[PDB]
Structures are given as C-alpha cells and as structure tokens.
Design a protein around this nucleic acid. Structure first.
Ligand SMILES: [Mg+2]
Ligand SMILES: [Mg+2]
Ligand SMILES: [Mg+2]
Ligand SMILES: [Mg+2]
Ligand SMILES: [Mg+2]
Ligand SMILES: [Mg+2]
Ligand SMILES: [Mg+2]
Ligand SMILES: [Mg+2]
Ligand SMILES: [Mg+2]
Ligand SMILES: [Mg+2]
Ligand SMILES: [Mg+2]
Ligand SMILES: [Mg+2]
Ligand SMILES: [Mg+2]
Ligand SMILES: [Mg+2]
Ligand SMILES: [Mg+2]
Ligand SMILES: [Mg+2]
Ligand SMILES: [Mg+2]
Ligand SMILES: [Mg+2]
Ligand SMILES: [Mg+2]
Ligand SMILES: [Mg+2]
Ligand SMILES: [Mg+2]
Ligand SMILES: [Mg+2]
Ligand SMILES: [Mg+2]
Ligand SMILES: [Mg+2]
Ligand SMILES: [Mg+2]
Ligand SMILES: [Mg+2]
Ligand SMILES: [Mg+2]
Ligand SMILES: [Mg+2]
Ligand SMILES: [Zn+2]
Lengths: 82, 99, 11, 155, 208, 126, 60, 116
RNA sequence: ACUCGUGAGAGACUGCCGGGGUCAACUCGGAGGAAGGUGGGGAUGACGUCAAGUCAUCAUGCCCCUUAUGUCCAGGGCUUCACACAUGCUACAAUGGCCGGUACAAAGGGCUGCGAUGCCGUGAGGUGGAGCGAAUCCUUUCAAAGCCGGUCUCAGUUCGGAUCGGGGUCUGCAACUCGACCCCGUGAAGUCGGAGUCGCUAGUAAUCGCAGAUCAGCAACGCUGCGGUGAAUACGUUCCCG
RNA sequence: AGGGGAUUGAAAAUCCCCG
RNA sequence: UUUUCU
C-alpha cells in the first residue's frame, strides 16, 4: 500500500484526460499505458483501454473497483493450462 | 594550554615509522613536548571475491585492506614548531591531519 | 460502500 | 584410526557427588550442548531416586548400571557372501558406555511426563532389574549365545 | 586455473605497490583516473618498451613515472612526445602532472620487456622456438639472473590446435616467498589470433 | 601488590591476590552470584585445593570477554599463576595437575566452500 | 557491455532511482564494489598487479 | 461455560478459553479480560453467569465475532472475485494470491499432491 | 601498576635424559616448558589430464547484420505451473512453549551517511536533531542460547506457522502483474519420516545470536565472517569407496 | 506390463512407492 | 557366492 500521508497515486496524464472527458460530459475510451494509477471516484463511470503489454484491454470502471490500481483488471500472462 | 593533535594514517607500516621519526625529530628540535608515536588499532576492510568468471563459486579469494594509525600529541605549540610542522614534507603514503 | 471507504483514508 | 589408537579424554569429577560415572551420564544426556540443562536433569533424577528408594543415589546408579552392563556382544561380518553375526567379548569401558547410552535412550521413550522423572524411574527400575533397558542387555546376551558356533572366526 | 600471479603473492613482502597515495573519500575517483592513465599509456607508445607505470598523488600535484626500455622514443628531443603525453594527462585532469621517464638499466632482466621481445618476434613472422631460446640466453647472461622460465601458448605457427610450450633454465622457485621473482605477461597480436607469453625471471632472494 | 592474568578463548581476567580469608570478589559480586553453576565453582576452587592453601586468600577479579565458561577457565589459570607468585615451590604440584597450561584451544576460522569450520555442504553424485 | 549502456549509465537519469553502478574498467553491471568502483574480476586483476594502494592478499 | 454461541472448554485459563471464539485470539483476550476486570488466571469451572453476561456485553459491543465475521470475510472474497481483480482470478484458479512462488511450493493452496 | 592497542625481540630445534636402532636415519617413554616432536589454522596447487568451464568480464581470428541481428522509450516478461528433481530454512513439542526479573561476547559498519535523550504511537515508525569522517559519537551501556521465578499437563494442544481477510508504515516518479516490515484476526500440513543417502575425529559436531559486502528498498532462510555454550566415538583393516 | 523415486559414469538387473 | 552391456 502507498502510505496515506502521500495521498493516492494518479499520474497527471490520465488525470488531465479524464477531467477533460467528464467536464465535456463525454464518456470515451481513453488509451492508457499507465498500470500504476489507482482508481479515484472521478473515474467511476468511464472506460479505459489499458496496456497489458501485448495490446489494449477494455476496462469498465464501476463503484466496487475504487481503491485499486488499474492494471489489476487487465491480466498479463496467458495461462490456459496443460 | 594548547594541544595540537597530529594524526597519521597509512596503508604501509614502515612509512608510518618514517613519518613518526620525521615529525618527532622536527618537534624535539624546536623544543615542544611530544607525547610520541602512540599506536591505534588497525582498520581492516575485507572483500571476498570469486576467482573465475562464470561459475565455480566455491573457489574464492580474500583481499584485505589495512590502515595503520599513529597519534602524535604536541603540547605547548611553540610558534616556531608550528611553523615547522606546516612546512614538513611527508611521504605519499602518509596522511597528516593536523588538528 | 467502497468509495466511502476510499474517502475515509484519503478524502 | 588407520595409524593407531587415538588418545582418550580426561572426564572430570562431579562436584556434588564425586563419581565420574555421573558426569559421564550427563555427557550422554547432553543435547545440543547445553551442559547446564543436562546437569540439573541428572541431579534431579538422582534426587527423585533418593526420595523414592530412600537410599544413596550413586550406589543405586552403580547397581543399575551393572545389571544392564553386557559382557558379551554381537559384531556383524559378511563372510563368503553370507552375513554372520558374531559373538565378541567386550572390554570394560565399551560396556559402561553401552549400558549408559542404553539406559538414556530407553529413558527418552518413557511416558512419565518429564525427563527428570523418566530418567529417575528408569534408573530406579534398572536397579530392581525391571526396566526395558535390562531387557535389552538380556537381548544382546541371548543373541550372543545363540550364535556361539560362529565364534570360531574369532574375529 | 593454476598458479597465482607472482607479483600479487609477494606483494606485502618482497615487492611493492605500483602506485602510492592515500585518500578514503577520494578513493574511487583516483582509481578511475588510474585505469584511465594506464589505458592511455598502454595504447599510445608501444614503440619503446613500457616496463612500468608508477603513479603518485599529493593533493593537487600528480606524478607519473614511466619505466621504459629506451627513453629516446618516448621523448622527441624537441619534447614532442612529452607534449602529447602531458596533454593527455591534462585531458584526464589530475590537475598538475609531472611526467618523468626512467630507462630501466638491464633490458633483459626485466620480465615485462623480455616478454615484449619474444612477443614481437613471434608477432612478425619469427619461428617461435627461436624467439624463446634467444630471450633465454640473453636474460641468462646478465649477472643477477639466476633462472628464467618462458612459457608461450596459443596457435603457434598458426596451426589449428593450441600448443603450449615451455622452457626453463636454472632455478625458478615459485612457492618460495623469500624468492624475488619478476613476472611478465604479454599477448602478441598475430594473423591467426593472439598468443600469450609469460616470463618468470628469478633474481636472487630478498632477506629482511 | 600481586597481579596476574588468565586467558581462555577470548576471555581475560586479571586477578589480585590478598592475604585475608576465603572471600571471592568478581566484579562486585560473590563467587556464587557470578558463575552460579557447581561445575564452574569447582573449576575455580580447584587450584587452591591442589595446593591445600584453600581459604588463605581474599581474591579480587576483573573479568572481560568470553562467557561464563570461558571466564571460568581464564579465572582458574590466573589464580594458579598467582599461587606461583606467592610461594614458588608449589609449582611442581600445580603444574602436574595441569592448572598452569594455557588452553591452546580457540574457535576455528570458518572456511569458504564449507558451512562452518569443518562441516561441508551436502553432496550427491547423481 | 554494449557501449550504449556504458555511456547510458553515465548520463543523468530522470529519476534518482534509475542510477546504477557498472564498474569503471570493463563496465560490468553485476558485482561492483563501492569503494573501488571495480567489479570482482577487475579488482582481482589490479589487486594482483599492485595498482590498488593498500589492498593486498589476505590470510588469517 | 457458554459464550456468544461458543462452548468454552472444561478447564482453561480464560485467555486461552476465549480463543475458541472465531473472532478472538490471544491479544484480544488480554484486552477483553483486562477491560472486564475478570482475571485471566481463572478456570472455566469458576466462571459465573454474571461474568458471562458482562463478557457477552463487552465483546458483542466492541468486537465482531463468529458467524457475522465469517459471512463478512466470505463476502470480501466473493466481492474481489466478482469485480474480476487479479486476486479474484487467483481465488478462482485456487492458486496463491499474494504473489508467492507457484513453480514449486504453494501446496497449501493447491492441496495434496496429484502426480503426472 | 594491571589489561589492551601495535612495533621490535625471545621461544621448539628430537635441543636435554632413558630404551630400541647396522651406533645410521628414525621410533617408545621421561624432564623442563605457555607449547613436544610437521603445537592449531591459513595463504601457497608441480608435469599434465578432462577437446571440462567461459567468444556475456575482457581481448580476439574468421564468418554473419548495417536500414537492421545497431540504437532510444513506454508497457510486459525474466516471479508463469498438472508436475519431477536439488540445496536450504521452520517444524512435528515439556531438554518444550508463553509472561516477568537478570548475567556474560567477538568482530565489524558509517557523509548528502550512522543518527542519540526527549515527545507522538500498540507496533512497524513519525517529529527532531545531540554527537561523530569516528579505540572518542552512533550502531543503545551491545547480544541470544544461560540462570531465577510463575503458568501450561501430553492434547493436533497455550505445539506448528503455512494460507486467507481486514487495517497500516517505510523506501521510491511508481509497490497491480512483483517489495519488505508491523497490528488484528484466520490456524492448514505435520505424531521424527520407505528404498536409499550425507556431513563430521576437538573448541570439531550440534545448537545460539551478531556484523558485513551487493543495496533507495528488499525476495537474505543466501553468501562471507565473528564470537557464545559445547559432546559422543575410533576395538581396528576382513568388507564398500578413492 | 506401466508412471515416479533409488542404486549406476549412463543403461539393463535389482529395491521401494503408486493408479 | 551374485555383478549383463556401453
Ligand atoms: Mg561457532
Ligand atoms: Mg538500483
Ligand atoms: Mg550493482
Ligand atoms: Mg609448502
Ligand atoms: Mg596440479
Ligand atoms: Mg567442449
Ligand atoms: Mg567480447
Ligand atoms: Mg563478438
Ligand atoms: Mg555469448
Ligand atoms: Mg524497458
Ligand atoms: Mg520488467
Ligand atoms: Mg531466475
Ligand atoms: Mg534437476
Ligand atoms: Mg533457504
Ligand atoms: Mg534456528
Ligand atoms: Mg505458538
Ligand atoms: Mg517458536
Ligand atoms: Mg526473558
Ligand atoms: Mg579474533
Ligand atoms: Mg512509547
Ligand atoms: Mg539496559
Ligand atoms: Mg496455536
Ligand atoms: Mg493431520
Ligand atoms: Mg504430541
Ligand atoms: Mg529410516
Ligand atoms: Mg581429518
Ligand atoms: Mg541491503
Ligand atoms: Mg547388447
Ligand atoms: Zn570490470
């Protein structure tokens, strides 16, 4: 866990992009490479294309998902089994 | 009363002898009280490295680094002796901290 | 309510 | 020991009793190298023996020891592709040792809830010749006299 | 992986460090300055045999003594080579640099140099056995020299397989700590590869 | 004054021997308070017993390094050297019982490739 | 060592934590002592050659 | 005795007894029994109904124990499993969740060893 | 004065006595002595072997790429997992666990580092900076196993800590994939381990903490060292191995 | 018979486990 | 005692 004293981490990149999107009231698919920004209530309804390293995965943000770093929801390695 | 502590460092032992001698003489010649070449403990910094590139981690080699230190306490710093110690030329191996 | 749990921490 | 018999160690004497037997016993109960623990265990076992039988501890220890001390043993040798167990006479010391270590080992297998108790009840019971350790010495003697034929190797 | 480096074995005892200074704080700096210096001096002048480089440092002032076979090729009488070198030492900026050249007296008692000789001949076209034997006799003539062992290994003659070959004369007492041994090593550059040349020259013994 | 030093495996003690009764003062405590084990007490009292001069000397001590056992051993040696200082002629008796030998046993340098000292790592030839 | 990386570790990083060591002489990333700034290999070399002032083989 | 749906063992020191409650462990016990003023060195046999009352009142007041606890924890797991979090996927597969080593060990997740 | 610190020096040589020795080497005992017979341990690897290892430390012959097999960055991977091996660590409990009181080390480490008293926390730690480039200051005056006392009564347990949930702290631009540490809960396998097999001959084995390098942080239970407490056995070459 | 351990320089043979 | 091949 990031300590409280620092406050939650969101890179300025998608902070700016998501602000522009929800001020114009338009909900788009935003293309992000940042796995490391935690989710804020500002992000609550939007959709994200996050990088899994091979591609961009669709992620619909909901209420239950706040408190979590984004790339949690785009898995990385593919395991089908043997 | 003024005590000047001349502190001596070296990697080599006998160079610490040379400097001991040099400064004890320079001081005695100018008539100040020299407590003399008082030995401190020797520092030892040890590094064990592997011998080969690429595996064989079992065969190793130890290298060491020793530092020998001597105290020279000069009591009653005659301004002449002071002018002499500022002007002493010591070996490249020896470090003199005059404080 | 996960967002309240969020705001208690940081706010 | 390819070059000859190696020297032996000078067991000191026990301060409270004065038997080297006793300190020998602490050195067979010595575990992980806390000698202090062994010391108070042994001393305690001797004290409990003292209150139960009401008589001197060293004496009952010697007696016990002598009832589990085997004279005869079995040393294995494979001969001609058939392995033979062989009767062999024991010199004294290897006997005190074997008896002691027997006592102790079968002390650790008792149900008596504490080492200081198990040990004591086991010495006390080797005195009366009751214990499983005495049975052990019996076992060795039995399996010695059973093989008496093979003594002819005298090895 | 066998014999340790003779020079390193006797280091506290029979032989001395190649460079004198002391600083704790500045240590790491000083050493990257050294690897720099010895790179420059190993690259620049191969004409005149380079025996040794001893470096000394006091505060700002720095002193590089280079031991060399013939000092004449390391300084043009006009001071041309001296200029090139003092310029390179100012580019490394140990600040002030006092550059001194000292010609080693006996060229054939010096292991590094003998080695360079063998290496040169082996490098041109020369038949290797010859080069070995020559260095041997040469060195063995001079008075201090007690025994000498020259070991050259590689593709020799350019044959494809690695021959090692080794020659000994007199005494070469490696495991003796009081034995002053001079070691030298050189890699001779050839059309077929590189071939290594080690030389041990045992001169007397040190007693202290 | 009398002084002497014992040393056993990284423990030094300095002993001062005094003419009085059988009191032991080690670093400001009694011999029973410091070394509270019968074994050790026996060890320290033994040289006195061998010279049969027990309880003729107040002993003062300064102990450092080692541990209980190491300091015990050192202590014994120091005592036994003090007794050669008081009355030389005991030396044949004392040194026959070994009390005057410095124990030349010390911890081994751990060696690399091994785990500690002599114990080697496991080995499988499969 | 690719010269790229060597000269790339001498640059100022955009984060304080991207700075790593990489020995001066051969430019080897792993096993680099802080005092000398050498990697175990280069260190055993210059040590044996006597170019490291006060280092020396050890025994005890 | 009987407390909060638990059955306290016949003879235990209170601190060890309370530990049979799914919500409590030794620390919470040295807290609770200090707060109530009941000695921790008492048996279960010497406990009274009054004491059981004050106890039940305290620990039901400030502390969640037992069934509710279980249901809640199971609720948090099924929660993070629903939203499709990485930890969720791990819980699904029956693998280790905390970023441990799955190449070799992890048998306490996987269970007994089934050979190929 | 005693240590201790580091310089110089003495001291172990079969030197002195007894016996065997071909009157030779050498061996069995004794004395003196701190030590007795290469006192203990290191560093020290002969000629060569094995086409052993490494063109990824480096250097390099030849061949290949040169619009990529160079190079710059973000994200991912090197941590995946039905398995199988290998080296370790914690265990399976009473010679033990847990709470309280108390005694003894050695070595080391420290500049944009080591960081004290004090104050805030339950605790990781926060606030603060004494004082030190360090036989001085800091790592607390240093330990843990030890000893004294209390409790637990042989049980899947006050054994065991894996796992999982919640709640945090610190490092870093950033702890999701992938950090460590602390708090609360959770509380699994495991009852000394088949065939087989490994280490060790005295301060050794066994067990107990401590420091270091690498390092912003750490996968450290690793590696290298330091000391504490400290055993058993060796009749002897028939057998296995070299 | 087959799978996994174990002896083996590597296989057979042998020895333990397993479905 | 028993020990096949590479
Ligand atoms: Mg140890
Ligand atoms: Mg880094
Ligand atoms: Mg590095
Ligand atoms: Mg030799
Ligand atoms: Mg060899
Ligand atoms: Mg090959
Ligand atoms: Mg290369
Ligand atoms: Mg290449
Ligand atoms: Mg390669
Ligand atoms: Mg990248
Ligand atoms: Mg990555
Ligand atoms: Mg890996
Ligand atoms: Mg394998
Ligand atoms: Mg491990
Ligand atoms: Mg442990
Ligand atoms: Mg527990
Ligand atoms: Mg425990
Ligand atoms: Mg305690
Ligand atoms: Mg030491
Ligand atoms: Mg507090
Ligand atoms: Mg205190
Ligand atoms: Mg439990
Ligand atoms: Mg079970
Ligand atoms: Mg049980
Ligand atoms: Mg078995
Ligand atoms: Mg041996
Ligand atoms: Mg670290
Ligand atoms: Mg065939
Ligand atoms: Zn390097």
């Amino acid at each position: 866990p990031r300590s409280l004293k620092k406050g939650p981490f969101v890179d300025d990149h998608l902070l700016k992009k998501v602000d522009v999107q929800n001020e114009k009231n338009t909900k788009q698919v935003i293309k992000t490479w940042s796995r490391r920004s935690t989710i804020i209530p500002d992000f609550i309804g939007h959709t994200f294309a996050v990088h899994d390293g091979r591609k961009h995965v669709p992620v619909f943000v909901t209420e239950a998902m706040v408190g979590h770093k984004l790339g949690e929801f785009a898995p990385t390695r593919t395991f089908k089994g043997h | 009363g003024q005590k000047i502590r001349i502190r001596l460092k070296a990697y080599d032992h006998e160079a610490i002898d040379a400097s001991a001698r040099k400064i004890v003489e320079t001081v005695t010649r100018t008539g100040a009280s020299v407590v003399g070449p008082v030995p401190l403990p020797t520092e030892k910094n040890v590094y064990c490295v592997i011998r080969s590139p690429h595996k064989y981690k079992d065969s190793r080699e130890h290298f060491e680094m020793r530092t020998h230190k001597r105290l020279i306490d000069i009591l009653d710093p005659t301004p002449k002796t002071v002018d002499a110690l500022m002007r002493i030329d010591l070996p490249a191996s020896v470090d003199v901290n005059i404080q | 309510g996960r967002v309240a749990r969020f705001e208690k921490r940081y706010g | 020991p390819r070059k000859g018999p190696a020297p032996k160690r000078p067991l000191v004497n026990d301060p409270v009793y004065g038997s080297q037997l006793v300190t020998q016993l602490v050195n067979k109960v010595l575990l992980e190298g806390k000698k202090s623990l062994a010391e108070r265990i042994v001393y305690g076992a001797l004290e409990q023996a003292r209150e139960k039988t009401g008589t001197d501890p060293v004496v009952t220890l010697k007696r016990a020891l002598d009832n589990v001390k085997p004279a005869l043993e079995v040393r294995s040798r494979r001969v001609g592709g058939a392995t033979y167990q062989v009767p062999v006479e024991v010199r004294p010391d290897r006997s005190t040792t074997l008896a002691l270590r027997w006592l102790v080992n079968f002390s650790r297998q008792r149900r008596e809830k504490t080492m200081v108790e198990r040990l004591a009840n086991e010495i006390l019971d080797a005195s009366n010749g009751l214990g499983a350790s005495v049975k052990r010495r019996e076992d060795t003697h039995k399996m010695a006299e059973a093989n008496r034929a093979f003594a002819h190797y005298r090895w | 992986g066998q014999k340790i480096n003779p020079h390193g074995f006797r280091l506290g005892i029979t032989t001395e460090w190649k460079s004198r200074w002391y600083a704790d704080k500045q240590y790491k700096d000083y050493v990257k300055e050294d690897v720099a210096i010895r790179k420059l001096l190993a690259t620049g002048l191969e004409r005149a045999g380079i025996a040794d480089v001893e470096i000394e440092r006091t505060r700002d002032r720095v002193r590089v003594d280079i031991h060399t076979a013939r000092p004449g090729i390391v300084i043009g009488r006009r001071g041309t080579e001296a200029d090139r070198i003092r310029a390179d030492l100012e580019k490394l900026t140990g600040k002030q640099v006092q550059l001194n050249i000292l010609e080693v007296k006996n060229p054939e008692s010096q292991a590094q140099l003998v080695a360079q000789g063998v290496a040169e001949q082996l490098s041109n076209r020369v038949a290797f056995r010859r080069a070995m034997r020559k260095a041997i006799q040469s060195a063995m003539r001079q008075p201090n020299v007690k025994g000498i062992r020259v070991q050259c290994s590689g593709r020799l003659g350019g044959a494809e397989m690695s021959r090692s070959e080794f020659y000994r004369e007199g005494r070469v007492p490696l495991h003796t700590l009081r034995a002053d041994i001079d070691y030298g090593l050189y890699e001779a550059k050839t059309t077929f590869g590189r071939i290594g040349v080690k030389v041990w020259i045992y001169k007397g013994d040190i007693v202290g | 004054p009398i002084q002497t030093v014992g040393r056993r495996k990284e423990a030094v003690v300095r002993v001062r021997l005094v003419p009085g009764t059988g009191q032991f003062n080690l670093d400001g405590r009694t011999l029973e308070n410091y070394f509270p084990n019968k074994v050790h007490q026996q060890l320290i009292k033994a040289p006195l017993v061998t010279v049969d001069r027990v309880d003729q000397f107040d002993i003062y001590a300064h102990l450092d390094g080692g541990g209980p056992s190491g300091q015990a051993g050192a202590l014994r040696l120091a005592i036994a050297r003090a007794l050669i200082l008081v009355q030389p002629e005991d030396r044949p008796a004392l040194k026959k019982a070994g009390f005057l030998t410095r124990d030349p046993r010390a911890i081994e340098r751990k060696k690399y490739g091994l785990k500690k000292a002599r114990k080697a790592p496991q080995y499988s030839k499969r | 060592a690719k010269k790229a990386l060597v000269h790339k570790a001498n640059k100022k990083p955009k984060f304080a934590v991207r700075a790593y060591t990489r020995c001066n002489k051969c430019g080897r990333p792993h096993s680099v002592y802080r005092k000398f700034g050498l990697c175990r290999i280069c260190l055993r070399e210059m040590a044996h050659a006597g170019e490291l002032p006060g280092v020396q083989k050890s025994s005890w | 005795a009987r407390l909060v749906g638990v059955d306290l063992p016949r003879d235990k020191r209170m601190e060890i007894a309370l530990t049979y409650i799914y919500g409590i462990g030794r620390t919470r016990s040295n807290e609770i029994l200090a707060a109530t003023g009941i000695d921790k060195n008492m048996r279960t046999k010497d406990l009274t109904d009054d004491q059981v009352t004050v106890l039940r009142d305290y620990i039901e007041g400030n502390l969640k124990v037992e069934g509710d606890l279980r249901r809640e924890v199971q609720a948090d797991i099924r929660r993070k499993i629903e939203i499709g979090c990485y930890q969720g996927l791990r819980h699904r597969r029956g693998l280790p969740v905390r970023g441990q080593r799955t190449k070799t060990n992890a048998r306490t997740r996987k269970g007994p060893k089934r050979t190929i």
